[PDB]
Amino acid sequence: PSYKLTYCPVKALGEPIRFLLSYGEKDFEDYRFQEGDWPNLKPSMPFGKTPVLEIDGKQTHQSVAISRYLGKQFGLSGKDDWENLEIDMIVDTISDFRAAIANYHYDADENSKQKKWDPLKKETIPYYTKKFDEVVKANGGYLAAGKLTWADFYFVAILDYLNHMAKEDLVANQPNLKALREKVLGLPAIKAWVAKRPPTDL
Amino acid sequence: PSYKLTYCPVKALGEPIRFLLSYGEKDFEDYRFQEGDWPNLKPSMPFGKTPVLEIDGKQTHQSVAISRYLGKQFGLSGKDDWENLEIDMIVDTISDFRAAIANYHYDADENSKQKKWDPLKKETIPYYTKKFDEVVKANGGYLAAGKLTWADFYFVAILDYLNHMAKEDLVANQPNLKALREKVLGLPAIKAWVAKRPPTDL
DSSP states (O other), rough: OOOOEEOSSSSGGHHHHHHHHTTTTTEEEEEEOGGGGHHHHHHTTTTOOOEEEEEHHHHEEEEEHHHHHHHHHHHHHOSSHHHHHHHHHHHHHHHHHHHHHHHTTTTHHHHHHHHHHHHIIIIIHHHHHHHHHHEEEETSSSBTBBBBHHHHHHHHHHHHHHHHHHSSOTTTTOOOOOOHHHHHHHHHHHHHHHHHHHOOOO | OOOOEOOOOSSTTTHHHHHHHHHHTOEEEEEEEGGGHHHHHHGSTTSSSSOEEEEEEEEEOOOOHHHHHHHHHTTTOOSSSSHHHHHHHHHHHHHHHHHHHHHHOOOOOOOHHHHHHHHHHIIIHHHHHHHHHHHHHHHSSSBBBBBBOOHHHHHHHHHHHHHHTTSTTTTTTTTTHHHHHHHHSHHHHHHHHHHHHHHOOO
């Protein structure tokens, strides 16, 4: 169909969608709006945020919801309700992890922000990176359902965004996560997209 | 099929699951841990948080992922992929709304917290409540897919928690949302549950 993605000129929450559409070998317009273009676009987005993926004229939003839908379209979802649960559960956990990082990163009060630095690095980050690595090992190198799913694509696609905010390489000391990253980035459709895409830090 | 729910002695993020199980005419152990016991429970949860739902022994977590699953079990999901996407998008949007509220409410610094009050009350709350009201009206009194779905159970179940944090009845002046609440709370299984459940401010 006709796909048009609208998002920031970075990877972040748009990248999982770009990863998935690529893997599905679907052509899509990759519209990246300029900084001064946003006040113009915001009012026409369903809840004033992006990513927004137009699918045959119809607006869709929410990076996770879209990723799940596209996952089912391209054969990357569970075989049954329970596998889809396992996928959904771990991705919402990725979101919790992102929220913990973003809570420091986007904090506008320097005093309060600095207060969150130590806890993030000393408790939160080590905890999740470990738990996630355990989960990956337990599924034989995947995040859920003992196989490659749209969660692996979502996770790896936003990883640079997570690293940038956390100011560290989150999977460097986590071998199963590191291998999952290498694996997903190693898939041809992704490898091909990654060599094409604009380089950004997020 | 056995069910055992583990969560705080409040409504909040556990309530959606209690609502759906009730609606599905399923008995379940509603375990509510005491404050002093949490330090020892935490490590036994998949990622150190509740709600956790044991489904025939198998642990599940993440309020939204669990609700999507149960919703499909009890005939409260989409007829196809597009409809389930529609439901998914509106629920993740509710999560965004909750995060904006929670950002103020859990701000431990009275200085940063106060900066967040006015924007929350003047911009965020009116924005989301009006938008959700439009959607519910445009869907004939439901949050998605023109029919009752698990989105409606999720929204109404957490609404008190949202009201407590926002320090106001958020739907008091949104008639389509107010009618949705009364509709869900009206349901026999819910009404029975609401009468039976321990009462809390959130």
